[PDB]
Design a protein around this ligand. Structure first.
Ligand code: HWD
Ligand code: HWD
Ligand code: ZN
Ligand code: ZN
Lengths: 260, 260
């Protein structure tokens, strides 16, 4: 056996740098939901591993011109990593080039507003211009709007793609900061899981409104045909059935909430 | 190519017999969410099919003594059917003998009460005896309680397994009828999807209370190693991404609701 290389991404509260990480070594430098999940998966599958942060800090997309895959998906496709354990959305285009376990978390696209903003739904956003709105610049949320045939979402994409200045952000933290510093003039579309986490963090000035726009899940990914695929899938099902996944979400989202 | 044999189960609103089914033929005898889903999957995967109702009317369990699998799972394992398209829960023990697509629907175990019953949670049920409660006699809901290590659910299973008369029912319709005819002295534990459907059907005397006890999903199943597996999985992802699955749930659950 050989040490398994795990690729993941810095995204709270899935993977975060510990306070004195600069003086720590190996897997000890990180903490979070996916760090805990990686330890459980490795134990039940019988392997040793090394956590690494994706080089380009992206989730995974295919360049239309070069046909090259970037992000965590790219690291698996080109053999730079053996497995990805992160909040990676299961999608058709990705399933065609890598394998995914059954979902370890369920979620959907949602709306985040600065408290007091006069918006209650996607419909509301699409019918006005005073309040700007956008999504992560690369990922499944942006693709959802780009390819949607649904009236409201199609109208939203038409606005977002031409809006100036750009309404797209580089990271989740950037989107949250923009909502907080825009005095209610910017609303952010992001996955419900991240929205729910931020709502319980100081300065407690944001909130999730309306229902989710869709339904999907995050899965553990492996290179197509990997010998680890089968065991990892069974491990995810085992951990969910014994209540470990629910325990971990409570641990990183609510047990330590800062807003009451 | 050969006609694909689909096994499914009579469970509203997934698969139901049309009014004059006795005078109809083939796939035309049935209607419902899974009937519509089967047509879409077959079209996108390029195959012709024949719908059949599982012989023993069960979902799928393995006899501890004979080691024989029954229900829809059994039909796939022994080669009596080529694919199962029904509200079949993705579980570890089943994943070990058959293949599942990514989920086409997300759900969780829930509580159904006759309106007015003084119960608001699983905790409430576990701390009293006046109001009896049970689950489907065979399936993932019963297994959840049987194998749970969680205090409240463990206390609930201890009560249910010895309760007299039996608190377990043969079908969902039987459980609903018992709730309706017991004057509030029987509460039923069932999947949220079925609970949500019944709440919108006359005589509009039931309701779902509390949150779900767990989180899981339904998947399309095929015999392990089947050549249909890959295409069926991609088709489920395609249908979810284009909004067809959400449209179908609204069509069979809410568009025709009977309770306002
Ligand atoms: N999980 C996504 C990435 N991602 C993350 C947060 C968010 O709000 N939107 C999004 O697309 C993916 O896998 O691309
Ligand atoms: N989907 C289940 C069957 N099933 C259906 C309804 C319900 O309330 N509980 C249950 O276990 C399975 O696959 O066993
Ligand atoms: Zn463990
Ligand atoms: Zn279609």
């Amino acid at each position: 056996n050989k040490t398994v290389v795990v690729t993941t991404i810095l995204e709270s509260p899935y993977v975060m740098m510990k306070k004195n990480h600069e003086m720590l070594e190996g897997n000890e430098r990180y903490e979070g939901y996916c760090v805990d999940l990686a330890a459980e998966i490795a134990k039940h599958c019988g392997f040793k591993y090394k956590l690494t942060i994706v080089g380009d800090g992206k989730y995974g997309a295919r360049d239309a011109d070069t046909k090259i895959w970037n992000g965590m998906v790219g690291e698996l496709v080109y053999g730079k990593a053996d497995i990805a354990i992160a909040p990676l959305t299961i999608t058709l285009v990705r399933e065609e080039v890598i394998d995914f376990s059954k979902p370890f978390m369920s979620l959907g696209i949602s709306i985040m507003i600065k408290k007091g903003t006069p918006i209650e739904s996607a419909e509301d956003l699409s019918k006005q211009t005073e309040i700007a709105y956008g999504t992560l610049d690369s990922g499944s949320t942006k693709e959802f709007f780009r390819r949607s045939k649904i009236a409201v979402f199609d109208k939203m994409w038409t606005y977002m793609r031409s809006a100036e200045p750009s309404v797209f952000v580089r990271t989740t933290a950037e989107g949250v900061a923009r909502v907080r510093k825009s005095k209610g003039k910017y609303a952010y579309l992001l996955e419900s899981t991240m929205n729910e986490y931020i709502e319980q963090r100081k300065p407690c000035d944001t909130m999730k409104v309306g229902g989710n726009l869709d339904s999907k899940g995050y899965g553990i990914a492996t290179p197509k045909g990997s010998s680890l695929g089968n065991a990892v899938n069974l491990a995810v099902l085992k951990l969910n059935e014994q209540g470990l996944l629910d325990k971990l979400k409570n641990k990183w989202w609510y047990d330590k909430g800062e807003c009451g």
